[PDB]
Amino acid sequence: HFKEYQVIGRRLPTESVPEPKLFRMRIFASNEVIAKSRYWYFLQKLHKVKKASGEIVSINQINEAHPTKVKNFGVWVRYDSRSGTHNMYKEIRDVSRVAAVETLYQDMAARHRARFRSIHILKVAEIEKTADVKRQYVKQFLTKDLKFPLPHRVQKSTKTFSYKRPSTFY
Amino acid sequence: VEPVVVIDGKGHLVGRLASVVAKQLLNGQKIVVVRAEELNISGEFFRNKLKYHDFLRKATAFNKTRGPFHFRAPSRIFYKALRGMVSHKTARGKAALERLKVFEGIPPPYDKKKRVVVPQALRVLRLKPGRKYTTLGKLSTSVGWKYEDVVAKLEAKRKVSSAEYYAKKRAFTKKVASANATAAESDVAKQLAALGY
Amino acid sequence: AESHRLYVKGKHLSYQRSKRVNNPNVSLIKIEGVATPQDAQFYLGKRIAYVYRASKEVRGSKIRVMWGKVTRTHGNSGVVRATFRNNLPAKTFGASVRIFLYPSNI
Amino acid sequence: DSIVKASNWRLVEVGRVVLIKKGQSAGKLAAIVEIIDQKKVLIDGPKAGVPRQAINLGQVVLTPLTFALPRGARTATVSKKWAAAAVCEKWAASSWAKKIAQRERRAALTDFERFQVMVLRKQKRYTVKKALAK
Amino acid sequence: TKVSVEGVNVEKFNVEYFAKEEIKAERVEDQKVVDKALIAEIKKTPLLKQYLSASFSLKNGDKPHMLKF
RNA sequence: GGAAUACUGCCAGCUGGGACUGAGGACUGCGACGUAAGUCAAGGAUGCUGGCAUAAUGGUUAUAUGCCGCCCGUCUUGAAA
RNA sequence: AGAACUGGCGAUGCGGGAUGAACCGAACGUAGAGUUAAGGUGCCGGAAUACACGCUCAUCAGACACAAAAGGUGUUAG
RNA sequence: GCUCCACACAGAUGGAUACGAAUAAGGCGUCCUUGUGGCGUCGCUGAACCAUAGCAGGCUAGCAACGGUGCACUUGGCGGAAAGGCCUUGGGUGCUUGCUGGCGAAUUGCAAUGCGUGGGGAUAAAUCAUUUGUAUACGACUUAGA
Numbered sequence: 001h002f003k004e005y006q007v008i009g010r011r012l013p014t015e016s017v018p019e020p021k022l023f024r025m026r027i028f029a030s031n032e033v034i035a036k037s038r039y040w041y042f043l044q045k046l047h048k049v050k051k052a053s054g055e056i057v058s059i060n061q062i063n064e065a066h067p068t069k070v071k072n073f074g075v076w077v078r079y080d081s082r083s084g085t086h087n088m089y090k091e092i093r094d095v096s097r098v099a100a101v102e103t104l105y106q107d108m109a110a111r112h113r114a115r116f117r118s119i120h121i122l123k124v125a126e127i128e129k130t131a132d133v134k135r136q137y138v139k140q141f142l143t144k145d146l147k148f149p150l151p152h153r154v155q156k157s158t159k160t161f162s163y164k165r166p167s168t169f170y
Numbered sequence: 171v172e173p174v175v176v177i178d179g180k181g182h183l184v185g186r187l188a189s190v191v192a193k194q195l196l197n198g199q200k201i202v203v204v205r206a207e208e209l210n211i212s213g214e215f216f217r218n219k220l221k222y223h224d225f226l227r228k229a230t231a232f233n234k235t236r237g238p239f240h241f242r243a244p245s246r247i248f249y250k251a252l253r254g255m256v257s258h259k260t261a262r263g264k265a266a267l268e269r270l271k272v273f274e275g276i277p278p279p280y281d282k283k284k285r286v287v288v289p290q291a292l293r294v295l296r297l298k299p300g301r302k303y304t305t306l307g308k309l310s311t312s313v314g315w316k317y318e319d320v321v322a323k324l325e326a327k328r329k330v331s332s333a334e335y336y337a338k339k340r341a342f343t344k345k346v347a348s349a350n351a352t353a354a355e356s357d358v359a360k361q362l363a364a365l366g367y
Numbered sequence: 368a369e370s371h372r373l374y375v376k377g378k379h380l381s382y383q384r385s386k387r388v389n390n391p392n393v394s395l396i397k398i399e400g401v402a403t404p405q406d407a408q409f410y411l412g413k414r415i416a417y418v419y420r421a422s423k424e425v426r427g428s429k430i431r432v433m434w435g436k437v438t439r440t441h442g443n444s445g446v447v448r449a450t451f452r453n454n455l456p457a458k459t460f461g462a463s464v465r466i467f468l469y470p471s472n473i
Numbered sequence: 474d475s476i477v478k479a480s481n482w483r484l485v486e487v488g489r490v491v492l493i494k495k496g497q498s499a500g501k502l503a504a505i506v507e508i509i510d511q512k513k514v515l516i517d518g519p520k521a522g523v524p525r526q527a528i529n530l531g532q533v534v535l536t537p538l539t540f541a542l543p544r545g546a547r548t549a550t551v552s553k554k555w556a557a558a559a560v561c562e563k564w565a566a567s568s569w570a571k572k573i574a575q576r577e578r579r580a581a582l583t584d585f586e587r588f589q590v591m592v593l594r595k596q597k598r599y600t601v602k603k604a605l606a607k
Numbered sequence: 608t609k610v611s612v613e614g615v616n617v618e619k620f621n622v623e624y625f626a627k628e629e630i631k632a633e634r635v636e637d638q639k640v641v642d643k644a645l646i647a648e649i650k651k652t653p654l655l656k657q658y659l660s661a662s663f664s665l666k667n668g669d670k671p672h673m674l675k676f
Numbered sequence: 677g678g679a680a681u682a683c684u685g686c687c688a689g690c691u692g693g694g695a696c697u698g699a700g701g702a703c704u705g706c707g708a709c710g711u712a713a714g715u716c717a718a719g720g721a722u723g724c725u726g727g728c729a730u731a732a733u734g735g736u737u738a739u740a741u742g743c744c745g746c747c748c749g750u751c752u753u754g755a756a757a
Numbered sequence: 758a759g760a761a762c763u764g765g766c767g768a769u770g771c772g773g774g775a776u777g778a779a780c781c782g783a784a785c786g787u788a789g790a791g792u793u794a795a796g797g798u799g800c801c802g803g804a805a806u807a808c809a810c811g812c813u814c815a816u817c818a819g820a821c822a823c824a825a826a827a828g829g830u831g832u833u834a835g
Numbered sequence: 836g837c838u839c840c841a842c843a844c845a846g847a848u849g850g851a852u853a854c855g856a857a858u859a860a861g862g863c864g865u866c867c868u869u870g871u872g873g874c875g876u877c878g879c880u881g882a883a884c885c886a887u888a889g890c891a892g893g894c895u896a897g898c899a900a901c902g903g904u905g906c907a908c909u910u911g912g913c914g915g916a917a918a919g920g921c922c923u924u925g926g927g928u929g930c931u932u933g934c935u936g937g938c939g940a941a942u943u944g945c946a947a948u949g950c951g952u953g954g955g956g957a958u959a960a961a962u963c964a965u966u967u968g969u970a971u972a973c974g975a976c977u978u979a980g981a
Contacts, residue, residue, distance in 0.1 A: 068515070068525045068526070068527075070507045070509055070515060070545065086835085087835095088834095088835060089835080090834090090835080093509055093510055094509060094513075095509060095513075095515065095527045099527075102810090103810070105810095106809075106810045106811080107810070107811065107834080109810090109811090110810060110811040110812065110834095111811060111812070111833065111834050111835090112834075112835080141508060141509075141510060145486075146486070146508060147484045147485070147486040148484060148485065148486075149482035149483070149484050149485070149859085150482075150483075150485060150530065150535070151299075151482070151858095151859050152299050152858075152859075153879085154295065155289070155295070155879075155880080156880095157289035157290055157880075158402065158880075159880080159881075160190060160194070160288060160290070161171075161172075161175060161177070161286040161287070161288065161881090162286065162287060162288075162289045162880060162881075163284065163286045163287075163852090163880090163881060163883090164287075164878090164880055164881075164883095165287055165858095166289055166292075166295070166858095166878090166879090166880065167857085167858055167860070167861065167862095167878075167879095168294065168295065168858055168860090169858070169860060169861075169878080169879085170482060170483055170535065170879085171399060171667075171881095172850095172851050173847075173851055174851045175851070176851065176853095181858095185799080186799075186806070188800085189799050189800050189806085190799080190800090190806085192799095192800055192801085193799080193800060196380075196460070196461060196800080196801090197378050197380065197397065197461050198378055198460070198461025198462060198463070198845065198846075199461070200851090202851090213814080214814080214816090216816065217814090217815090217816070217817090220816065220817070221817085224817075252800090254800085254801080255799085255800040255801060256800070256801065257800085257801050257802090258801090260741095261740090261741065261845090262460060262741075262742075262845085263801085265845045266461070266845080268845080269845085273916085273917085274916090275916075276853095276916090277916045277917055278914075278915095278916070278917070278918065278919095278920080279853095279914095279917090279918095279919090279920065279921095280851090280853090280917095281853075281914095281916090282853050282914090282920075282921075283851055283852090283853055284851065284852060284853050285851090285853075286851090286881095289880085290799095290806055291806090292858095294857090294858055295858090296806090299858095299859080301814080302814080320916090321916095324916060325916095327916095328854095328855095328916090329854070329855055329856095331854095331913090331914095332853075332854045332855075333854055333855065334854090335853075335854065336853090336854040336855080337854085339853090339854085340854095340863080343863090344863095344864085345605070347863095347864090349601045349604050349605050350601065352604065353597060353600055353601050353604060356597075356600070358593050358596045358597050358600070359597060361589075361593050362590065362593045362594065362597060365578075365582070365586055365589060365590050365593070366575055366578035366579045366581075366582060366590070367579075367590050367593070367594065368662075368887075368888070368889070368891085368892055369664075369849060369886070369887050370664045370665065370666055370848085370849050370886095370887070371662075371664050371848085371891065371892095372664055372665045372666075372848080372849085373663075373664065373665060374665075375665075375671060380803095381742065381802095381803075382742060382743090382803090383803065384742075384743070384802080384803050385743090385772080385802085385803065386772090386773080386796090386797090386802060386803075387743065387744065387772095387802090388743065388744070388772090389742055389743045389744090389803085391742070391743090395803080400668075400669075400670040400672075400673075401672070406670075406672050406673075408693065408694080409671070409672035409693080410672070410694095411693065411694040411695085412693075412694050412695085414946095416947095416948070418846090418948055419846065420846085427949095428948080428949065430948050430949080431948090432947080432948050434947070436694095436695085437694080437695095438694075438695050438696095439694065439695065440694095441803085441804085442798090442803080442804050442805085443798090443804075443805050443807085444804085444805080446803095446804090448695095450695085455742090456740070456741065456742090457740095457741050457742040457743095458740065458741045458742085458845065458846095459741095459845075459846080460741090460742070460845075461845065461846085462845065462846050463846060463847095465948085468671060469946080472692085472693065473671075473676055476870085476871065476872075478860090478871075478872095479857090479859095479860050479861070480859085480860085481860095482859085492879090494879090512809085512810080524681080524682095529808095529809075531808085531809085534879060535879090536879090568876085568877065568878090569877090569878085569879075572878095572879095576882055579882070580673065580675070580882070581675060582675065583608070583675055583676070584608075584663070584674075584676055585608045585654075585655075585658055588654070588657075588658045588661060588888075589654055589658075591886090591887065591888080592654065592657070592888080592932080594886090594887095595886090595887090595888090595932065595933075596933065596934090598885090598886090598903085598933095599900090599902080599903075599931095599933045600933080602902055602903050603900065603901090603902050603903085603933085604902090605902080605903095606902075607902085622724095625944070625945095626944095627942075627944055629942070630941060630942065631941095631942090634941075634942095635941080638941075657888065657932085658888080660888065660889075661888035661889085661932090662888075662889090662892085664849095664887080666849065666886085666887060667849060667850075668881080668882080668883085670882085673882080
């Protein structure tokens with residue numbers, strides 16, 4: 001289960017430079033250690049700050065404001081694969097940011113074969129109104145009075161032998 | 171749970187059914203398989219037909235008879251599929267195979283006894299909808315089986331008079347339900363209902 | 368009257384073994400009506416008796432019984448490990464075994 | 474004159490009361506509020522007790538009963554609509570809830586109660602056999 | 608299930624009572640007294656005597672880990 | 677405006693189900709209960725019950741079978757061969 | 758082909774890998790109980806026909822880096 | 836195979852409890868114009884149905900049903916795929932826990948479940964012998980003789 005963390009670093013302030021830029025970003029990780037490692041990697045890559053002169057001011061966990069509210073999430077993702085790195089944008093209809101990022105990671109590992117090692121979450125934002133969604137598969141669930149069945153349900157059997165010839169009707 | 175289990179092989183996967191039957195056999199359970207010709211295998215017919223040829227093409231040069239044996243009956247094919255899943259060439263494996271019987275259709279006295287199915291081996295429960303599948307009977311007929319006509323002819327007779335037996339059972343259950351209904355609302359019936367019966 | 372059974376019938380699968388090594392001191396027993404380790408937890412410590420007929424009569428009877436006990440659960444299918452005073456012949460693989468309700472706690 | 478038979482499906486939609494099969498709230502009724510995707514649906518069962526959450530359709534089984542419900546209703550509105558529709562009364566009358574209750578009662582039976590049930594069953598069978606063939 | 612026992616005297620019995628040093632007459636008399644004391648309590652509830660007389664045995668589909676005693 | 681729950685970590689918190697071990701051999705010590713006498717789960721188990729002399733039980737041969745095991749010695753080459 | 762430095766072997770058993778000299782763990786008194794590594798959990802084979810998200814019909818798929826630069830009115834995502 | 840004599844004694848313990856077909860559909864009841872018809876009703880596992888009380892299941896007296904059930908008979912039907920089993924009419928004989936009573940349990944002491952051979956009598960058949968070739972190196976094979 002993923003979790004959202006906030007990490008800030010200001011590169012061990014020295015003489016003549018008190019309170020540096022104080023780089024701030026949000027990191028999604030399953031634990032504090034992984035969040036700190038990802039923050040260090042992002043600082044090394046995007047910025048010129050390394051752990052040699054770095055410092056973790058504070059790490060905090062951010063909880064989604066409305067864990068029971070359905071939202072459409074627009075995520076900008078930059079990931080690396082066998083080919084060169086390129087930007088990517090996707091839209092996810094989920095309830096919480098953590099679930100949306102988890103689904104994005106699962107899709108990337110499934111379709112693009114990209115795993116957590118080479119995936120960067122640039123930004124996660126909520127789409128407020130309809131007709132701003134640019135993906136058809138997300139617009140699919142926005143239709144008014146959406147009703148559909150669940151044909152051919154895969155019923156589970158607790159016994160090897162069943163004297164019923166079960167039907168998959170729903 | 172049952173001294174002998176009769177499994178209806180119609181609309182079942184050869185692989186899963188054979189695996190479960192072998193596993194039950196290794197546990198000391200007697201199982202009888204019926205309607206082997208109706209067994210189904212995933213994939214289009216040509217793929218299954220091509221697969222059969224490449225296993226019989228390996229006929230030994232010096233001694234073909236003592237070498238691979240190619241059986242066309244669907245029951246023989248099912249037994250071969252299940253045979254490989256059991257540790258044959260050993261006393262434990264040989265004893266287990268003695269508990270399994272495979273027949274085409276439902277020969278008596280099994281025709282007059284209850285039969286069961288394996289939910290995890292049903293073709294209509296595992297295969298994705300709309301996907302191609304192969305029938306064991308048609309494959310056997312293509313590869314040399316010559317008893318499909320008689321099998322179907324005497325299986326149709328099996329449904330004949332068994333529909334009549336079911337009709338008689340339904341008529342009897344009509345009177346049984348009427349007797350239960352007229353016996354309802356009584357003190358004993360009310361007590362049974364309160365006690366979950 | 369119709370039935371006098373006071374035990375839960377089971378099946379002896381095989382000894383606790385690896386891919387190429389087996390430990391006859393521990394036997395795996397399948398209990399009817401048990402599907403999860405939680406259900407099998409109730410059967411722990413129950414006496415296990417294997418009943419078979421012997422050609423020779425020794426104590427005025429043709430039935431010889433080997434006793435055992437339930438040690439711990441095995442796997443996720445309800446299989447439970449069992450240890451007997453004398454290990455099973457290894458020919459009883461799949462043979463029926465009897466599990467009693469004593470020593471009972473309920 | 475047109476005929477279209479055997480097309481009754483339990484559609485998944487807002488206001489579709491469902492029964493949870495697996496999870497903490499297994500066996501507790503829930504009402505679908507908003508559909509997230511083909512595999513995730515938001516449910517709320519405040520009358521039953523299950524807290525509002527997004528559940529996987531694989532962990533829940535639909536039920537024939539249905540009731541009107543505004544899309545994306547909150548817990549209070551969902552509970553109000555549940556009370557107004559009186560879906561609980563319909564649920565009990567159905568043979569499915571009766572079967573659940575009978576199974577629970579049988580699982581809760583006692584040895585002495587089992588003996589009483591056996592005696593009552595014997596008496597009922599005797600009465601039925603006497604009634605039969607007459 | 609329980610049956611009233613306050614009306615039955617049991618303090619007399621002890622470990623030495625069952626010692627074995629053709630049934631002892633005192634044992635029969637004590638059994639008769641206990642039966643007389645407990646028969647009223649047994650009859651206090653319907654079908655209790657029949658339930659006690661009937662033996663207990665298992666049947667197909669019975670799961671002791673699921674049955675309630 | 678207000679509490680509850682989820683998660684993390686703690687309990688020198690409480691209490692059930694199962695398996696193996698019984699090692700030491702009159703006290704010397706660390707400890708607890710108890711005003712005291714005395715007691716205790718405190719440097720390793722005690723008490724009771726059931727089977728027994730035409731015994732209980734144990735030992736050898738083959739077959740009955742779960743699994744494994746290349747034919748021994750010397751010598752070549754870093755090894756097997 | 759011949760040389761310079763460096764980690765295992767050689768004197769070395771065990772588990773895993775259909776078997777295994779260049780592969781992983783683990784380096785060894787006789788025993789009991791328990792927990793694990795690599796390796797595994799449809800049968801042979803002791804262990805879930807576990808969960809969730811997507812992908813592929815392959816007329817010799819798939820579960821093993823050279824011929825791989827390109828082609829396809831095959832499919833799912835940017 | 837018939838008869839007389841001598842000798843031995845891989846795993847039950849409730850019931851394998853019978854339609855077919857579809858699985859993007861199905862059963863059951865009922866109704867009508869008799870149709871790929873109308874209404875109700877059910878699945879979401881067999882967690883199901885029968886039977887399950889009696890010194891391992893005795894003796895005995897009544898009530899109510901006259902039904903349920905074991906037994907050898909008895910009339911008839913069905914079952915050729917491995918039928919070999921399924922029943923069905925009539926009576927007889929036992930139980931009936933469907934209902935109400937009277938007798939015994941103990942000491943087992945707290946548990947080690949609790950049906951051919953080898954010797955004869957007779958009689959069906961086979962081999963060799965013998966002999967013809969249709970077979971032939973030798974085996975082997977087709978024939979004839981109370």
